[model samples]
Target: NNNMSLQDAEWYWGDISREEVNEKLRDTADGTFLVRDASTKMHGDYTLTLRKGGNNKLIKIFHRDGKYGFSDPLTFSSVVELINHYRNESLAQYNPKLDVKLLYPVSKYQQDQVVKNIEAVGKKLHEYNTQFQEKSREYDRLYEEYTRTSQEIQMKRTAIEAFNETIKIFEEQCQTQERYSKEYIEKFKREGNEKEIQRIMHNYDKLKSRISEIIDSRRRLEEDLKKQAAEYREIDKRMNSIKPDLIQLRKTRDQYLMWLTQKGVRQKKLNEWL
Candidate 1:
């Protein structure tokens, strides 16, 4: 009776070695199943391994499709229960010769769905590539503009400093002339001294106006340069966001492509049954 526990199932009728039993159990424990050439006269001579511990005594009683072997262990009990409940229904349409053919369609459908999912992912990847290229170009152009503007700003700042120094020198000269004129007027009230004093004052007033103009121009130029720098920084931020998405999409696309290729090979083998 104990041996019957191991051998009474229609799937396991012949004498099996302990090694063979161990091998089958190993396959079962790993959540895998084996498929053999069912056209041969032998019924279960080639044992299919199931997921680890999956081919327990309870699962051997079902009318499982030999093409795919047993269900996964997680669903094995429910699958057994469903089979028992539907046993009568299965008998109503049971035809051993057409069972494989009927099951083949379901596999075909699964393959088709997988193909569709893969294609959808491919389409998304293509869109991502196009967007990435556009964003990259924008980023490059902005970066170049920012660098050029920064150099220009530096040059402008140098020029402004030079102009400021010139203004400072002119102011010092005006102050010296004013001081000399005031001293000469206080020392002597002669006509020549008055004319000299008027000349010096006129010169100082003109220099002061020129210096003010230079200062105003420099301020305006500085503000414009700062605005340009800010605009470039904003563009850089936008580019940063896009770059990561592009990288992630490329990685995902490559991974999916590899998976699709492997799946394609498996599908070719599956098509032979159709």
Candidate 2:
């Protein structure tokens, strides 16, 4: 009934070398043990790397005749069972002078992996959060600029339209005055009144120039409106491009946070049990 596999156990650090085992258990307490696939070609053999008296001790686990133990008369069917037996009982019974208790088995290999995964996920979450902040600030700046530019364009357009209305009124008044003056000028010229004709001609000339000035002002305003529209378009394009990535980054960061939360809980539970 030896259906159990030693390689799948949490305390088993498979295929690790002696130096690595010593380093892994360097600062651990005495009797802390971890199992490794033995360097010896003894096919199902294992090495228990144990910390004892501020030093490391290597005990070979022999697997022979469908049984596992440290020495003769191997009673357990699996190395895991043998370790369990020694944990509650004593290894001193096998060797009269060797008093070894398997305390604090280094079963943190999987838990260490969980911790590393949590840390990696948390670090990425921090990185994405930083980018999200910068992108949000950039989006705000663009939005404000776009809003201000659009509002200014609207105001300028309204002002130009109002000025156009006033200019149209002036032109209409000039047309009426020109029609009436033509008759008056003809009458005055027939009665030898050149001064009245000249006066009327000079007034029309001044009115035409004033209308031209107003047209120039309107042209300038229209040019400014065009420029504002161009800038608004550019801001809109940039905002559109940044928006998708910002949203995606936020989603990615949330996923990382979820992964961190899951791993944190797992690590905590594993620690308490270990």
Candidate 3:
């Protein structure tokens, strides 16, 4: 705190005033100043609040961090266009040289006068609940989709397995029937009775018909397996596509949680002055 109060103490970060003490803060205005456009709606993106620190004129900008990160404290002159744009959107056009010192004095008690002003406890609950629902909804969507895709892939593989096993059974039957028919043909070459010959011929005919049926059954199963494999590939492709979006949304959610925690810490410090 003692070292930061000097205005002439910068350049350690090479090109920028990385940090400075607001030794000059006690004499400056410590309140809210908003330059508003009647056209600026109160809802949606870029809506924000600026608070002057309790001990000093250390102005900290507070905004929802779904799309941005707070790195280091800003250099006011470095982002003039952005500052004006935020003011025009969030709450201003002013010349830093003369009009900058003319803002309304902001204090701790009248937080609503400049900040979120969440005065209504019930409404605050409702507001947070409403926003939280969307976050919950998005998380469920990604998670459920990931889970459902995995189940679909498993089902397809099982279906392919069913076709494969059925084909194997049919082919094995065909081989067994052919071996018996060949042995009957060898016996026919050495038969001593005409009656025995007729019985053997009948069995041979039955075996030929059974073998044809098994071959036809095997062919159909082979086709079914091929079609099922194609379906499996397509479903696997869809699973791959859904994952990246899930990863990104989860990353966004965790960062918001961090921002909320940081806000509480800052709020505690700001309250010390009250």
User: In candidate 3, what are the lDDT values of residues 1-274, reduced to their tens digit?
Assistant: 2333212322111111212122212345543432211123323222122234443322333234322212233333222234444434432233233223324422223321333333363345345555566756765775676567566656656765765666677678768877767867666667667887788679767866776775666566556656755665675576577557655555444444334454564433543364
* Residues 1-274, model 2: lDDT tens digits: 4445665666787557877677568788878988888887578787887887788988888788878888887887877787878888877767776787988888745444653355665456567777889889988988998899889989998988998898889988978877876776566767987776688679878877988989998999889989988888888899888889887787666555545564556434543352
Query: Candidate 2: RMSD over Cα atoms?
Result: 20.9
List, residue by residue over 17-76, the lDDT tens digit for candidate 1: 444444444433232322222223365423332333334222332234433224332233
Error of 2 at 48 (Å): 52
Off by over 4 Å in 3: 1-194, 265-274
Off by over 4 Å in 1: 1-121, 178-182, 192-194, 257-274
User: For candidate 1, what is the total of clashing residue pairs?
Assistant: 12
In Å, residue 112's CA in model 1 sits off its true spot by 19
* Model 2 stretches astray by more than 4 angstroms: 1-120, 265-274
Q: Which ten residues in a row have the lowest lDDT in candidate 1?
A: 98-107
For model 1 the TM-score comes to 0.45
State in Å the error of residue 234, model 3: 1.4
Residue pairs with clashing backbones, model 3: 4-21, 5-21, 30-106, 31-105, 31-106, 32-106, 87-92, 88-92, 112-117
Global lDDT of each candidate: 0.50, 0.77, 0.45
> Judged by TM-score relative to the true structure, which candidate is superior, 2 or 3?
2
lDDT of 2 at 268: 40
